[PDB]
Every structure is written in structure tokens, then in C-alpha cells.
């Protein structure tokens, strides 16, 4: 047992570990659509960066669930980090709802972790989950479905001038 | 009597009381259209943002009546704010001719009491009316009116590309 | 069903709308509190300007359900907001009695949201109440207490030097 | 006639200078009042400051009285200024309640050369009157009517102490 374990049940740190692996995932996925929208037949650079950044996000997430395990005195393991499901996204309107649906993933294991937490009598694991993840999750998602709403309005997919006045006035300027 | 009561009639005092009323019931309605275009399926920031705005301006435009009824001696009475008259508001452009008539039902109450203000010889409350709610009437009925112009102009309410450009150019950035 | 709703029940959202309505006839009734306090047979400034500060606290705790609602991909619904309960509120300490039940009963609607909150399993909603609402009730109930003592102690209601002190010194010289 | 003259009737003329003499009129009689608080058996600094300053205000309303005249066209016509109606004047309340009856008489005429400028059809006598002169009669009115409030909360004229506690707080520190 590590000297500084209290409270901290093996279930929740498999549960830790599990979560990792899932935002390692999700920054991966965010790379991926990174390089599709910077290919030189998609040219969408803000979108693109928006990806980046989401992507570096997610990292840091992951490294935050490593340093809370330490902290806890569980073990830090490691999975393989799968590749993304697609290897191309279509457009800003089909990768933005593949965002989506990853988001709502992230914040069901979150709430799922958040159960098991109470379930086990954790209440510095609930606070971490609360104060730290989930309502990032939900500016997240709304972020995101704000996206769409407008992506949809600007007649994505078909509208490419739509999708070009996306890049330019809806996501920042890099 | 109020101690301070001079040239102030009864009348007067009871129409400032309605008017007090109107104003907050125009703030009510501008914070439902806020709420409304901040919803994930509306999402025109910019626009619920310049209605959030009217909304906070018509409180202050409540609080100066409040002030002005004590300043008179007369005796602020409040009544229920009653919501506003659809829980739904379309699109800018429907959302925007609401506004319309609002402002121009709220300078109708504003010149009926001017009327009355003339006709109960009472020069301090014609001014106050001048000098404090008639011109800022006839801006706010000026701008929104070029707005429903513009939005007509770029093809509301078919075309979502118009309505998104109107919320990047014709309002504030939020 | 909103592309952004996750693990929100309808039951909280309508109890959400509850609440923001409550907010804003706690706002009115503020308001009401510094009409009566400006009253030139009423006089006391710095007694009606912290129940002006209550008042615009009240409907910026409005606003934050408002925009919580959205977020959650709930839809906000208005309500008639009630008038408040007296049109003249006495002297201060009957005010800050009044004042005092009032917060108690927004706390005690929170608490109950809180209650609704967890039966559902939503720490997301729960996060946000203790985070955003129930410290500043239970800041302001002290607050509000602390100044009945001192009200007492001056000798109000009778004591009308003890009421002008009170002013002076209690609350923020504005 | 004055080469610059234009729909400026002789009664206005006349009134206008009948008005100058109470401006004059109101400013000797707060001077008395200074005087008055500045006896050594009086003592209360800040009243007497109060009331000297009340006195240069209306001086200054006698001249741009003079001014506007001459900006029409008229002759300015002086008279005696007549002694104020009391040598001594009991007590802060006594003389807070004299500035107001005086507040009141000053603002019954400038009301009156309103009604005659309006019957003369002089729209610039009108809003000379209403811009520089109406309103702040409302706001004096309403300030003294708040200090005789809160003068008999603190027991005047019997408590000396509510007495000596007006003038530290309720009159800005000379
Ligand atoms: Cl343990
Ligand atoms: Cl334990
Ligand atoms: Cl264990
Ligand atoms: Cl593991
Ligand atoms: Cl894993
Ligand atoms: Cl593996
Ligand atoms: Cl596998
Ligand atoms: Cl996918
Ligand atoms: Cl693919
Ligand atoms: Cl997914
Ligand atoms: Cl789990
Ligand atoms: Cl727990
Ligand atoms: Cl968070
Ligand atoms: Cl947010
Ligand atoms: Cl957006
Ligand atoms: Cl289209
Ligand atoms: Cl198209
Ligand atoms: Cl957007
Ligand atoms: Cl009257
Ligand atoms: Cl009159
Ligand atoms: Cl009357
Ligand atoms: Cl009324
Ligand atoms: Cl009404
Ligand atoms: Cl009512
Ligand atoms: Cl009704
Ligand atoms: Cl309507
Ligand atoms: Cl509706
Ligand atoms: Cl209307
Ligand atoms: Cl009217
Ligand atoms: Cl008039
Ligand atoms: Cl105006
Ligand atoms: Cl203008
Ligand atoms: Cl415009
Ligand atoms: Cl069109
Ligand atoms: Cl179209
Ligand atoms: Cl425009
Ligand atoms: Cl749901
Ligand atoms: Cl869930
Ligand atoms: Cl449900
Ligand atoms: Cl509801
Ligand atoms: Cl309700
Ligand atoms: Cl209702
Ligand atoms: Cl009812
Ligand atoms: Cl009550
Ligand atoms: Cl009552
Ligand atoms: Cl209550
Ligand atoms: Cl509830
Ligand atoms: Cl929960
Ligand atoms: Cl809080
Ligand atoms: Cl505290
Ligand atoms: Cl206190
Ligand atoms: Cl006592
Ligand atoms: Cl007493
Ligand atoms: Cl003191
Ligand atoms: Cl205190
Ligand atoms: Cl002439
Ligand atoms: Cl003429
Ligand atoms: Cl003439
Ligand atoms: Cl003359
Ligand atoms: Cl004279
Ligand atoms: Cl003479
Ligand atoms: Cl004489
Ligand atoms: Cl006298
Ligand atoms: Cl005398
Ligand atoms: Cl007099
Ligand atoms: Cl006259
Ligand atoms: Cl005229
Ligand atoms: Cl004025
Ligand atoms: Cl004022
Ligand atoms: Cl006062
Ligand atoms: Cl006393
Ligand atoms: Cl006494
Ligand atoms: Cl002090
Ligand atoms: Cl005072
Ligand atoms: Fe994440
Ligand atoms: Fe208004
Ligand atoms: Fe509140
Ligand atoms: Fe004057
Ligand atoms: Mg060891
Ligand atoms: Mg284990
Ligand atoms: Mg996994
Ligand atoms: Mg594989
Ligand atoms: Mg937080
Ligand atoms: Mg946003
Ligand atoms: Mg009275
Ligand atoms: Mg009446
Ligand atoms: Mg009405
Ligand atoms: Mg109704
Ligand atoms: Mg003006
Ligand atoms: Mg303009
Ligand atoms: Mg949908
Ligand atoms: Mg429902
Ligand atoms: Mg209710
Ligand atoms: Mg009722
Ligand atoms: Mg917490
Ligand atoms: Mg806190
Ligand atoms: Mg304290
Ligand atoms: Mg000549
Ligand atoms: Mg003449
Ligand atoms: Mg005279
Ligand atoms: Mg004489
Ligand atoms: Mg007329
Ligand atoms: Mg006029
Ligand atoms: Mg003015
Ligand atoms: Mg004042």
C-alpha cells in the first residue's frame, strides 16, 4: 500500500486509468482532424487551429488524471492510445459533429467516474471531477452545438463559400 | 401630503406608476429574445448580446421613473411584470419587428403622458419626458428600423447566410 | 431533444425556470425596498442603495440560471413576476426582516433544487449550485442577521437616532 | 426698441426682472442663516456652511437672470432686496423648514413665468426655465425635504444631541 493512501479504492484508480487512455484518445482524434483541415485541399487554417488547440487541451487533461493519481497514491498505467476512427472529416460540419459525439463520450465516462466516486464514498474524487472536468464539458458542448447550429445555417455541406465564412468569423484567428 | 409635493397632479403620478411598469415589461421581453439567441439552437451571439443590452437599458429607464416619482412626492406602486408575449422569438428578423413595435408602443405611452403632462400644466415632467425618454425613443426606433432594412436586404428569413453575416457586421461584437 | 442535452433531466430544467422566476421577484421586492427608502418621508440613502445592490444582485443571479439553462439544453421559460408582498416596507428593521425571510426562502428553493439535483444524479447541477448560489445565501443571511441585531440594539423601531446611526454606519456610505 | 429684440413680450421682460429680485430675496435670506448657525450660542459649522453656500447658488441664479436679459433684448430693473423675514432662526429645524416654504415660493414663481412665457408663445423663455432653473428646484426641495425627516428621526428641535449629529453627517464637512 503506498504510504499516502486514504480512501482511494482500487476501483476508482482503475476507473483513473481508464479515463486517461480516454483523453489521450480524444487529444489524438484532435490531431488527426489538425492535419485534415491543414492538408492543401481542405485549407480551412482557423478550423485547423481550433483543432490543434482542442487537441493540446486534451493532453492536458490526461496529465492532470496523472498527477491526481499520484497524488491519491495509486499507480499510473498505461494503454495503447487507438488511432482516430476516421483518417479523413469530410468537412467543418461532419468534423464538428464527430467533436460532438467525442465530447458527450468524454463527459459519459466523466459522469460514469463521478458515480463510482460516490458510489465508493469519494468526495475528493467527486470534487476533483466537478471542479476540474465537467464543466469544461459542458462550455465544450455548447461550444460545439453553437458550431453546428451556424455550420447548418451557412448550408454546410454543400455552401463552400458558407464553410469559408465559418473559418473566417466563427472560430479566432490564427 | 408629501411635504415636498408641488404642482403635481394625481393623475401624473399614476400614469408615471403604469409607465414605470411598461419599461420593465420592455426589459422582460428584450431578456427573453437575450436568452433565446443564446440557445445552442439559435446561436447568433452578437444578436443576444445587443438584446441583453436594451434589456438593462429599459431597467435603468424603470429606475429613473422611480426616482422622479420620489422626487415629486409621489408614491412609487408597483404592479406584476407580466411576461412577454411568446416564449419563442423565430429568427432576428422576427425578433427584431417585435422590438420595433415595442420601442413604438413604449414612445406612445411616452407621448401620451407628455399629453397629459400639457394638459395638467406641469412643465418639470414635460421636460423630464424631453430631455430624458423621447429622443432615446426615437434612436432606438431609428437604429432598429435600419436593422430590419438590412436584415430584409440579406434575404432574412431564408437565408441563414444573411442572418449569420448581420450578427458578424450589424451589431456589436460581443 | 437539444444536440448538447446530456444526463439533464426534465424535472430539473423546469425547476430551473422556478427558480430563475424566484430570483427575479427577490429583484423586485429589492427594488421595492429602495423605492420605499428614497422616499423623501423615508430618507435613509445608504439603506436604499444596499437594497439597490440586492435588487441588481438578484437579477444577475437570474441571468446566470438563464445562461445555465442553455448551456444544459434546457429552454428557458418566463413567468408573470409577481409584485412584492407590501408596497411599503416600514422602517428599516421591519425591511431587513422582511429581507432576511426572503433570502431564507431562495435558500431554501436552492436547497430543494439541490435535493432534486442529486435524486436525479446530476453533480454537473449540483457543482453549480453550491459553487454559484448557496455561499452567497449563506453569506447574505449573515449579513442580514448580523444587521437585525445591531437594528435591536439601536432600539428601533422607536429609537429614531439609533434608525440614523444605523444608516451612517452599518451599510456603505454611498 | 433693443435692435436684438425678437417675441420677447414686455409682461416677460417684467417678470423676469420680478424673479431676479427673488433670487436676490432667497440668497440674503440664507445668508442670515449662515450668520445665524456661525453665533457662537448656535455652533453647527456645517449647517452654516450649507446655508452660505445655498446663498451664492442663488446669486448666481439672480445673474444669469440679468444675463438673460440682456440676451433678449430687456432692461434689467432693480429694486430693493428686502431684509429676510427673521433675524434669528431657532434651531436646524426651524431653518430647514423655512428653506423649504422659500424653496417652494421661489419655485410657485419661476412655475408662473413659465405659464406666461407659454401664453406669450416665448418657447426660449421656456426652456431657459426648464433647462436652468426647474429642475433644480425639484432637487433642492427634495434634499431639504430629506434633511427635515431625518431632523425630526433625531428628535429636533428637543434632542440636541440628534441635533449636533445632523450637522457631523447629514451636511458635508466644512
Ligand atoms: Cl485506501
Ligand atoms: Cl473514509
Ligand atoms: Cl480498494
Ligand atoms: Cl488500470
Ligand atoms: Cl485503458
Ligand atoms: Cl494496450
Ligand atoms: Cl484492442
Ligand atoms: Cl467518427
Ligand atoms: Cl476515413
Ligand atoms: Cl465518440
Ligand atoms: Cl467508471
Ligand atoms: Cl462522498
Ligand atoms: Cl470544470
Ligand atoms: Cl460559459
Ligand atoms: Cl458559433
Ligand atoms: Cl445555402
Ligand atoms: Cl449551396
Ligand atoms: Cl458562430
Ligand atoms: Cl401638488
Ligand atoms: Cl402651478
Ligand atoms: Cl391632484
Ligand atoms: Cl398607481
Ligand atoms: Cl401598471
Ligand atoms: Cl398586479
Ligand atoms: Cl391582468
Ligand atoms: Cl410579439
Ligand atoms: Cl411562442
Ligand atoms: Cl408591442
Ligand atoms: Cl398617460
Ligand atoms: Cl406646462
Ligand atoms: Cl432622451
Ligand atoms: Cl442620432
Ligand atoms: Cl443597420
Ligand atoms: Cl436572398
Ligand atoms: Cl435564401
Ligand atoms: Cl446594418
Ligand atoms: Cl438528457
Ligand atoms: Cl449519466
Ligand atoms: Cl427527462
Ligand atoms: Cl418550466
Ligand atoms: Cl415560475
Ligand atoms: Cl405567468
Ligand atoms: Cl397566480
Ligand atoms: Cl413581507
Ligand atoms: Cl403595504
Ligand atoms: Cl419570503
Ligand atoms: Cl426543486
Ligand atoms: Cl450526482
Ligand atoms: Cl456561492
Ligand atoms: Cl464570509
Ligand atoms: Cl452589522
Ligand atoms: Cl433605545
Ligand atoms: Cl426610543
Ligand atoms: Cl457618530
Ligand atoms: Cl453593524
Ligand atoms: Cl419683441
Ligand atoms: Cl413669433
Ligand atoms: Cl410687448
Ligand atoms: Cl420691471
Ligand atoms: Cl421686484
Ligand atoms: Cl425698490
Ligand atoms: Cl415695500
Ligand atoms: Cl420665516
Ligand atoms: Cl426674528
Ligand atoms: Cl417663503
Ligand atoms: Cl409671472
Ligand atoms: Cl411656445
Ligand atoms: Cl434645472
Ligand atoms: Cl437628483
Ligand atoms: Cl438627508
Ligand atoms: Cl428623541
Ligand atoms: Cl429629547
Ligand atoms: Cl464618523
Ligand atoms: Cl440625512
Ligand atoms: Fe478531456
Ligand atoms: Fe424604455
Ligand atoms: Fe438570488
Ligand atoms: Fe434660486
Ligand atoms: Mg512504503
Ligand atoms: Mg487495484
Ligand atoms: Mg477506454
Ligand atoms: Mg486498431
Ligand atoms: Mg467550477
Ligand atoms: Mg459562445
Ligand atoms: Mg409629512
Ligand atoms: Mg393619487
Ligand atoms: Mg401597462
Ligand atoms: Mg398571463
Ligand atoms: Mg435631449
Ligand atoms: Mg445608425
Ligand atoms: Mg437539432
Ligand atoms: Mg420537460
Ligand atoms: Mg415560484
Ligand atoms: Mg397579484
Ligand atoms: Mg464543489
Ligand atoms: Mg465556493
Ligand atoms: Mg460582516
Ligand atoms: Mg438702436
Ligand atoms: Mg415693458
Ligand atoms: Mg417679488
Ligand atoms: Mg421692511
Ligand atoms: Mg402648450
Ligand atoms: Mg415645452
Ligand atoms: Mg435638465
Ligand atoms: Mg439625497
Chains 1, 2, 3, 4 share one sequence.
Not at 479504492?9 to 483513473?16: F, G, N
Amino acid at each position: 500500500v503506498s504510504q499516502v493512501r486514504q480512501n482511494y479504492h482500487s476501483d476508482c484508480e482503475a476507473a483513473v486509468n481508464r479515463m486517461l487512455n480516454l483523453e489521450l484518445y480524444a487529444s489524438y482524434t484532435y490531431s488527426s482532424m489538425y492535419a485534415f483541415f491543414d492538408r492543401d485541399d481542405v485549407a480551412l487554417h482557423n478550423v485547423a487551429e481550433f483543432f490543434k488547440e482542442h487537441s493540446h487541451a486534451e493532453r492536458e487533461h490526461a496529465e492532470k488524471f496523472m498527477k491526481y493519481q499520484n497524488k491519491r497514491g495509486g499507480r499510473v498505467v498505461l494503454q495503447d492510445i487507438k488511432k482516430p476512427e476516421r483518417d479523413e472529416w469530410g468537412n467543418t460540419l461532419e468534423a464538428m459533429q464527430a467533436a460532438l459525439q467525442l465530447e458527450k463520450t468524454v463527459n459519459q465516462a466523466l459522469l460514469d467516474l463521478h458515480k463510482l466516486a460516490t458510489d465508493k464514498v469519494d468526495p475528493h474524487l467527486c470534487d476533483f471531477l466537478e471542479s476540474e472536468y465537467l464543466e469544461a464539458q459542458v462550455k465544450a458542448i455548447k461550444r460545439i452545438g453553437d458550431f453546428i447550429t451556424n455550420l447548418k445555417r451557412l448550408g454546410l455541406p454543400e455552401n463552400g463559400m458558407g464553410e469559408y465564412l465559418f473559418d473566417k468569423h466563427s472560430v479566432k484567428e490564427s
